[PDB]
Amino acid sequence: SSATTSLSNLRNLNDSLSQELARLKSNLNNEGMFYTATPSASLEVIKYDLSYLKEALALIKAKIGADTKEP
Amino acid sequence: ISSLELYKYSIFFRNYIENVAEDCLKNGLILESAAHNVSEVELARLKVQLKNALLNCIISYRFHGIGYVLVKTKDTLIDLEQPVNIELPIGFEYLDYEYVRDLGVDFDHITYKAVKIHKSRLIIYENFDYILKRYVPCYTESFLLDIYLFEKIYVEIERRIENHNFLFYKDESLVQLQDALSSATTSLSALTQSNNNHSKDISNLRNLNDSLSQELARLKSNLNNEGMFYTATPSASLEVIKYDLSYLKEALALIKAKIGADTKEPLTRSFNEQAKGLGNDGKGDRSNYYDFLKGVQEQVENSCNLKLTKYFGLDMKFNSLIMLSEEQKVERDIKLIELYSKYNQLIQSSSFNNEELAMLKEKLFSF
Amino acid sequence: FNSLIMLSEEQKVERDIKLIELYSKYNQLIQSSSFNNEELAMLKEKLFSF
Amino acid sequence: ISSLELYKYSIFFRNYIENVAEDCLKNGLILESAAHNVSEVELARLKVQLKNALLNCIISYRFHGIGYVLVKTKDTLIDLEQPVNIELPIGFEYLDYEYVRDLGVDFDHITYKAVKIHKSRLIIYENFDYILKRYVPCYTESFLLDIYLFEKIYVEIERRIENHNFLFYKDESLVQLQDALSSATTSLNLRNLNDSLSQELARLKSNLNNEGMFYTATPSASLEVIKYDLSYLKEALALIKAKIGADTKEPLTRSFNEQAKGLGNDGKGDRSNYYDFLKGVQEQVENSCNLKLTKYFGLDMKFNSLIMLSEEQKVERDIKLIELYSKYNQLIQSSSFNNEELAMLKEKLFSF
Amino acid sequence: ISSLELYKYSIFFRNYIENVAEDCLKNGLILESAAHNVSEVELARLKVQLKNALLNCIISYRFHGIGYVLVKTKDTLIDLEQPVNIELPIGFEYLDYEYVRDLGVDFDHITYKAVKIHKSRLIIYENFDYILKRYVPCYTESFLLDIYLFEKIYVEIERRIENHNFLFYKDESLVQLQDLSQELARLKSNLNNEGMFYTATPSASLEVIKYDLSYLKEALALIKAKIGADTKEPLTRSFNEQAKGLGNDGKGDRSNYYDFLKGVQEQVENSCNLKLTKYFGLDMKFNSLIMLSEEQKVERDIKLIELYSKYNQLIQSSSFNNEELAMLKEKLFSF
Amino acid sequence: ILKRYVPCYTESFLLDIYLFEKIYVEIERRIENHNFLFYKDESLVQLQDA
């Protein structure tokens, strides 16, 4: 982020850093195993829900059926 | 959302567009000549070409909002501008919408690619909306959004299929010793960048990740060999990370409901699970698809006969949407013969007045 | 192309039986009716088989 | 995944390969001679040998993509190279695919083991895919993967059947003293510690068996049952069955021998997918055989009808036909229709 | 996995092997002589011995891949090497597979235990797989594994039946006694007496340890599915819950087991008649797999008589042309 | 509409077939190690690391 801020010597620095980051990420993603070294590291799946929209659709269908006579 | 892009990518949109035209021209046409001078073979060939043109005409009507069929006669390319009084057409050719320039109903000619063609030689099938004061297709932005979501569900499924389940491993081993030395070196190098053994840091990082790959290979090898994953660190952790699909399932249900609400084509609504509902049930309670097809057929007939009869002396008709089977025909004939026999018996064995019999005649449907 | 729907032997026999019954009913009506020639002709067109 | 290895290991693959051929030759063949000079007994023996050859021919067609049947005549081994104009075959012999070398359709001979055989004496049943421009078997890599997974499920079941449930025991007792000393000094008497540890473990096992109570001294001692699970394999079996049913049309293979072949008589023209597939295979085999049996040998072969009527069905059909004839006779006798109308009825009637 | 060991240990494998042979020879055989000179009693005795030999022949065919039946004639033990031109057999004797040495089809003799027997006196029923280029049995390694797992489930059940539930107890003064032990066992007996277990240590613990069987139940379900997929024998697939399906339903839609039995019977008939007719002048046939009951026979006779009556009525009360009647004759099945 | 010759299938249909196969591809990938043991111990690594 500091590199990108400065962009918005350094060439070799960024090349080495990018190489290492890319290889670490590629290994962890390819082996089907996410590895980390920090004892306090955390990984959680965040998920959305649709029950609100389903219930709203039911209520809206009921209201439309009540509000019109066209079958 | 681009209709052309959706048409290219999705076969569902293509089927939705083309099903109506295919159903309209499924049962065929009837072609007749007012003068009663054209032979039946030539007229049948003309009918075949007319059907071929009408399919693309209806497809263009649904996709763009207007469809053009050129009535080709025995004339030169420059003679298309001149009007036609009375002629027998040589054939019918559908004209591509993208190559047709029309300035409106106030003009009596179009430009095709720049050949000027008079409107008297063209069969025009247009969907003009008076509220919008413009020609519109059969679909809207909401329908396009529904189709796009229908495809995006499986796009996301493909995005997350490979790594739906994976392992999260936290280990403070020799590997973390290397990794933590690496992390401290990278942080210090970041400080220096913000501002020299950074090359030493780089060589570290490289060898450290080499050893990391070696150790991960060894761990996987042990897992495969003895089915047991062993670790040294008392704070080591191993957890299975899993994805979910309930969101996409519920979205599919809602999208199917929306599509069914937004279209009347039974195959599109039911995802090719329901029939077209164009059979004979012996009752006058016809289907919504039947009514829609009848309206489309009436509009097409009006559009064709507005100029086929006036300028070419030809009349076109659509075949009946409901086609009776042989057994149904035999049953209907049997019932009609029974009705006639009952009527004859009543007439022979009754003494009703002439006025009463006549009055019965009008109130009877068959007689 | 040959017809997509192929009838079985039993179906053919049943159809033949029904057609023969229809012809017998038509013959009985013609023999035992006193309808006018125009009415009989008009019945002929409105009948599918005849 | 190797098709030969899968064939050797799995009986399901073998049955899938052989069921189509067995069903095709279940009802038998009809053999005829154009000259009408061959006696029926010799022709029946020829038909038996032809069926025996055709079974292996179809099996090789499904497994490899091509099948070879040699039409053996009264000739020497060197005469096989020479073409045949008109002859009466002595028999039929299936040729193994691995011993046949064919350079393509542009050549009119093959090498068998190195005897040169002209193609006019050979019945060839090949599955050529024009998209792939090569001969292909009836199975693909996905189907092989499905079969492999089907077997691997029970492979894993056998792997984890014995220790599906076991005991995890933690104890900082004399036994942990023994094992800690062993650990330390082996990393660096000890065999006596070994013996004492085993003795105490066996003693505790004996106590457990005797009085149904496991007792321990350490306040931090723990005992937990470790258990395995099978829901993954159950769901995988369901998915694999669905995939197999989608990937093949053979009813026994799809239903795991739970459904019938569907080759009966229902009195309707709505035949089954397996019936259509078998009819197509039979037509291809008939074409392949008659391309050279009639031209070079004066023989014609036909397949028996896939649908075989029972005696009761035959009697019922005869009764219905007799009733139809009686109705037609009654109508003709008691009608006064015109000759043209009766004739027109004749064509529109199926039976008459 | 050893097929012989599995056969010895499991009755299910034995039944799977023997059911096909028993069903094939359930309805019996028909034996005839081309010369029409042999008396019926002697021929019936020959048929009985032939059935007895054929049962073991089919069993050996299924278990090993080949089965041998020796056709015993009025000859000496050394005359078995000599070929036979025309003779009337004295009997049939099944030959054990383990005592038969055959070098292949290119040879016309075998060694039995070392008596040399010509192949013209032997009925051979073999299952040769052209893909494998060898004789193979009716079972494979996967099927053997399925049977082994089927037995191992109850092996494990027996292993863990006795201690499915037990007590885990933690106490410090009690081990001060143990390391007295039998006296605390007697205190557990006092628990059994008074219905109340009492202890001293505030950190003493008592927990019931229990086992589970869901793994074995699911494995049994999967194994049953695999067996049903891997075999066609209805009893083996359904665990003796379904019938053989060899009845008469009045329809041509026969069963898979019927088709399999018909194929096996055809192969056996070919194998026998390849040498019974040529060398011995005898012909063998299998009885029909479907056997009609008396009521079914009466019903069929009634229907046939009705059909004949209808045909006679039509012929008497019709005025059809001779060509039309003839054409009806061919298109009628019965006439 | 496309002004070109097109087959009977589209990219979405190809994607559907590809996913249909990829499901069992993943099943094969994770069939062998669907259940395994995770064990943590310090003396046993005192043994193994040596």
Name the H helices within E118-213. 141-160, 173-178, 181-194
What is the separation of C-alpha E31 from the centre of its chain, rounded to a whole number of angstroms?
Answer: 24
What residue in A sits closest to B236 (Cα-Cα)?
A: A39
Chains that touch F (3 or more CB pairs under 8 A): B, D
Q: Give the integer Cα–Cα distance in Å for B287 and B321.
A: 12
Nearest by Cα to D218 from E231, E172, C5: E172
Q: Do D351 and C15 touch (CB under 8 A)?
A: no
Residue with tokens 């089977």: B325
**Closest Cα in chain B, distance from residue C32 (Å):** 9
Q: How many CB pairs under 8 A join D and F?
A: 44
Provide the 10 A C-beta neighbour count for residue E108. 9
- Dump the DSSP string for B112-146: E--EEEEGGGEEEEE-EETTTTEE--S--HHHHHH
- Cα separation, B13 vs D151, whole angstroms: 41
Q: Which residue of A has its CA nearest to B243?
A: A45
Q: Which helix (H) or strand (E) holds E118?
A: strand E115-118
In this structure, chain B runs to a length of 367
Q: Where are the alpha helices (DSSP H) in B25-94?
A: 40-63
Provide φ and ψ at B241, rounded to 5°. -100, 125
Count CA atoms closer than 13 A to E79's CA, side-chain side.
8
Collapsing DSSP to helix, strand or coil, C4 comes out as: coil
Q: Cα separation of B154 and E231, whole Å?
A: 39
Taking the C-alpha atoms of residue B10 and residue B148, their distance in angstroms, rounded to an integer, is 9
From B296, B297, B314, select the one nearest B305 (Cα to Cα).
B314
Paired strand residues for E209: E166
Q: How far are the Cα atoms of D16, D21, D26, E214, E254 from residue D279, in angstroms, in the given order? A: 18, 12, 13, 47, 18
Measured between beta carbons, which residues in chain C are less than 8 angstroms from residue D334? 24, 27
Cα–Cα distance measured from residue C11 to residue E86, given in angstroms and rounded to the nearest whole number? 56
Nearest to B261 by CA among D110, E178, A61: A61
Q: What are the two backbone dihedrals, phi and then psi, of residue B69, each rounded to the nearest 5 degrees? A: -125, 120
Per-residue tokens: C12: 């053919």
Residues of C in contact with D323 (CB under 8 A): 17
Cross-chain residue pair B220–A31, CB shorter than 8 Å: yes
Interchain contact, D239 vs F47, CB within 8 Å: no
Q: Which residue has the tokens 């998920």?
A: A47
E118 forms bridges with which residues in the sheet?
Answer: E109
F42 is written with which tokens? 């310090």
* Residues B333, C19: C-beta atoms closer than 8 Å: no
B39 dihedral zone (left: phi>0; alpha: psi -120 to 50; beta): beta
CA D249 to chain centre: 11
Distances (CA, A) of B201 to A15, B176, B196, E282: 13, 16, 10, 95
Task: Give which of B216, B220, B224, B235 to mutate to test A binding, by max A Cβ within 10 Å.
Answer: B216
* All partners of chain C with 3 or more CB pairs under 8 angstroms: B, D
Instruction: Determine the number of helices (DSSP H) and then strands (DSSP E) in chain E.
Output: 11, 12
- Which one-letter amino acid corresponds to residue F47? L
Alpha carbons F36 and B240: distance in angstroms, whole number: 12
Distance between alpha carbon B8 and the CA centroid of its chain, in Å? 11
Torsion sign across C-alpha atoms D1, D2, D6, D8: negative
Distance, in Å, from the CA atom of C16 to the CA atom of C49, rounded to the nearest integer, reads: 13
**Cα gap D204→E181, rounded to integer Å:** 12
Asked whether the beta carbons of residue F39 and residue B236 sit closer than 8 angstroms, the reply is no
Question: Cβ distance B180 to A37 under 8 Å?
Answer: yes
Residue E73 CB neighbour total at 10 angstroms: 16
Contacting C with CB below 8 Å, chain D residues are 267-269, 317, 320-321, 323-324, 327-328, 330-331, 334-337, 345, 348-352
CA distance D164 to D230: 10
Tell me the C-alpha distance between D154 and E227, whole Å.
11
Cβ proximity of A4 and A17 under 8 Å: no
Looking at beta carbons, which residues of chain C come within 8 Å of B326?
A: 15
Name residues whose C-beta falls within 8 Å of residue D93's C-beta, 6 or more positions apart in sequence: D53, D69, D70, D72
CA dihedral C26, C28, C32, C37 (to 10 degrees): 20
Q: How many CB pairs under 8 A join C and D?
A: 55
Which residue, B126, B127, B208, is CA-closest to B175?
Answer: B208
Closest in A2, A32, A54 to B250, CB measured: A54
Distance CA D299, CA D84 (A): 14
DSSP, collapsed to helix, strand or coil, labels residue B262 as helix
What angle do helix axes B40-63 and B11-24 make, rounded to 10 degrees? Answer: 140
**Min distance F42 CA to chain D CA atoms (Å):** 10
How many Å apart are CA B338 and CA D313, to the nearest integer? 34
User: Which of D26, D8, D9, D13 has its CA nearest to residue D275?
Assistant: D26
In whole angstroms, give the CA distance from residue D75 to residue D82: 10
Q: If you search the block for the tokens 């081309």, which residue do you land on?
A: E34
Beta carbons of D186 and F24 less than 8 Å apart: no
In the B/F pair of chains, how many CB contacts fall below 8 A?
A: 70
**Which sign, positive or negative, has the C-alpha torsion D92, D97, D99, D105?**
positive
Instruction: Write the CB contacts of E254 (distance below 8 Å, at least 6 apart in sequence).
Output: D264
- Please report which helix (H) or strand (E) contains residue B336, including its range: helix B326-348
Burial bucket for residue B333 (CB in 10 Å: 0-12, 13-18, 19+): buried
Q: Distance from A50 to chain B by nearest Cα, in Å?
A: 6
Q: Do E331 and D321 touch (CB under 8 A)?
A: yes
Query: Alpha-carbon distance D98 to E133, whole Å?
Result: 10
Rounded to whole angstroms, the maximal C-alpha distance in chain D is 123
> Which distant-in-sequence residues (6+ apart) come within 8 Å of B267 by Cβ?
B15, B19, B274, B276
Q: Do E169 and D216 touch (CB under 8 A)?
A: yes
**Three-state DSSP class for B357?**
helix
> Would you call B298 exposed, middle or buried from its count of C-beta atoms within 10 A (0-12, 13-18, 19+)?
exposed
Dihedral class, residue D21 (left if φ above 0, else alpha if ψ from -120 to 50, else beta): alpha
Residue B46 backbone phi and psi in degrees, to 5: -60, -40
Write out chain D in H/E/C secondary structure.
CCHHHHHHHCHHHHHHHHHHHHHHCCCCEEEEECCCCCCHHHHHHHHHHHHHHHHHHHHHHHHCCEEEEEEECCCCHHHHCCCCCCCCCCEEEEECHHHEECCCCCCCEEEECCEEEEHHHEEEEECEECCCCEECCCCCHHHHHHHHHHHHHHHHHHHHCCCCEEEEEECCCHHHHHHHHHHHHHHCCHHHHHHHHHHHHHHHHHHHHHHCEEEECCCCCEEEEEECCCHHHHHHHHHHHHHHHHHCCCHHHHHCCCCCCCCCCCCCCCCCHHHHHHHHHHHHHHHHHHHHHHHHHCEEEEECCCCCCCHHHHHHHHHHHHHHHHHHHHHHHCCCCCHHHHHHHHHHCCCC
Cα–Cα nearest to B305, from B133, B54, B128, B130: B54
Nearest CA to B213 among A20, F38, A41?
A: A20
CA quadruple E84, E87, E93, E96: dihedral, nearest 10? 10
Helices E11-24 and E256-280: crossing angle in degrees, nearest 10, is 60
Contacts with B234 (C-beta within 8 Å, 6 or more apart), sequence order: F40, F42
How far is E285 from E268, CA to CA, in rounded Å? 9
CA atoms within 13 A of residue D191's CA, in its CB half-sphere:
0
Residue type, E158: E
The one-letter code for the residue type at B215 is: E
Both tokens of E264, joined, read 């096996």
Q: What residues contact residue A36 under an 8 Å CB cut-off, 6+ apart?
A: A43, B168, B169, B170
Rounded Cα–Cα distance for residues B313 and B305 (Å) = 9
State how far the Cα of B367 lies from the Cα of C4, in Å rounded to an integer. Answer: 39
Measured between alpha carbons, how far is residue C10 from residues B206, C2, E234, E309 in Å? 82, 20, 34, 21
**B151: Cβ contacts below 8 Å, ≥ 6 apart:** B9, B10, F12
Spell out where chain B has E strands. Answer: 29-33, 66-72, 91-95, 100-101, 109-112, 115-118, 122-126, 128-129, 134-135, 165-170, 228-231, 237-242, 314-318
- Burial class from Cβ neighbours inside 10 Å (0-12, 13-18, 19+) for residue E60 reads buried
d(CA E189, CA B271): 72
Give Cβ neighbours of residue C44 (< 8 Å, ≥ 6 apart): C50
Pair C47, C23: CB distance under 8 Å = no
Query: Which residues of D fall within a CB distance of 8 Å from C7?
Result: 269, 350
CA B24 centroid distance within chain: 15
The amino acid sitting at B344 is N
Closest CA to A58 of B259, B267, B253: B253
Residue in chain A lying closest to B169 (CA):
A35
Are E131 and D322 inside 8 Å of each other by CB?
no
The one-character DSSP state at E173 is H
Instruction: Please check whether residue E89 is in contact with residue E101, taking contact to mean a CB–CB distance below 8 angstroms.
Output: no
C15, C19, C25 ranked by CB distance to B337: nearest: C25
Distance CA(E248)–CA(E293), nearest Å, equals 9
Contact B151 F12 (CB under 8 A): yes
Cα B304 to Cα D338: distance, rounded to the nearest angstrom: 45
For residue B182, the chain A residue with the least C-alpha distance is A20
Cβ–Cβ gap D183/F43 under 8 Å = yes
* Method of elucidation: cryo-EM
CB E143, CB D154: distance < 8 Å: no
From CA B268, how far away is CA B17, in angstroms rounded? 10
User: Residue B223 gets which letter from DSSP?
Assistant: H
CB B142 within 8 A of CB B178: no
Q: What is the phi/psi pair of residue E96, to 5°? A: -65, 140
Which residue from A6, A48, A57 is facing B254, i.e. has the nearest CB?
A57
DSSP for F6-30, please give it: --S--HHHHHHHHHHHHHHHHHHHH
Other C-beta atoms lying within 10 Å of the C-beta of residue D164: 23
Are D269 and C5 in contact (CB < 8 Å)?
yes
Q: Measured between alpha carbons, how far is D241 from D212 in angstroms, rounded to an integer?
A: 45
* A with D: touching (≥3 Cβ pairs within 8 Å): no
Residue D333 CB burial class (10 angstroms; 0-12, 13-18, ≥19)? exposed
Min CA distance, C48 vs chain B (Å)?
6
The chain C residue lying nearest B336, using CA atoms, is C47
| Cβ density class D276-296: b for 16+ within 10 Å, e for less | eebeebbeebbebbeebbeeb
Contact assignment for F37 to B229 by CB distance below 8 Å: yes
Contact B111, B352 (CB under 8 A): no
- Helix, coil or strand: residue E312: helix
Cα–chain center distance at E47: 22
Best CA proximity match to E128, nearest among E112, E105, E103: E105
Q: Are A32 and B163 a contacting pair, CB within 8 Å?
A: yes
How crowded is the C-beta side of B286, counted as CA atoms within 13 Å?
10
Q: Cα-flanking dihedrals φ and ψ of residue B169, to 5°?
A: -120, 120
For residue D239, give the nearest of F27, F47, F50 by CB distance.
F27
One-letter amino acid identity for E2? S
Residue with tokens 């209805």: E234
Give how far B339 is from chain C: nearest CA, Å. 10
Structure tokens at F13: 């249909």
From the CB of residue D261, how many other CB atoms can be counted at a distance below 10 Å?
A: 21
Element (H, E) at E283: strand E282-286
For residue A37, give the chain B residue with the closest CA: B176
Phi, psi of F45 (to 5 degrees): -80, -30
Contact D81, D118 (CB under 8 A): yes
Provide the shortest C-alpha distance from residue C5 to chain B (in Å). Answer: 12
Residue of chain E whose alpha carbon sits nearest to that of D308: E252
With an 8 Å CB cutoff and a minimum of 3 pairs, decide whether chains D and C touch: yes
Query: Residues B47, B49, B51, B53: what is their CA dihedral angle, to the nearest 10 degrees?
Result: -140
CB contact under 8 A, D187 and F32: no
Contact present, F36 and B227 (Cβ < 8 Å): yes
Sequence-distant (6+) residues with CB within 8 A of F34 are D156, D232, D233
Angle between helices E294-316 and D311-333 (to 10 degrees): 20
Structure tokens at E165: 């539930």
E204 CB-contact burial (10 Å; exposed 0-12 / middle 13-18 / buried 19+): middle
Q: Which of E152, E170, E302 would best serve as a mutation to test chain D binding (most D beta carbons within 10 A)?
A: E170
Determine whether E18 is exposed, middle or buried from the number of CB atoms within 10 Å of its CB (0-12, 13-18, 19+): middle
Distance between terminal CA atoms of chain B?
60
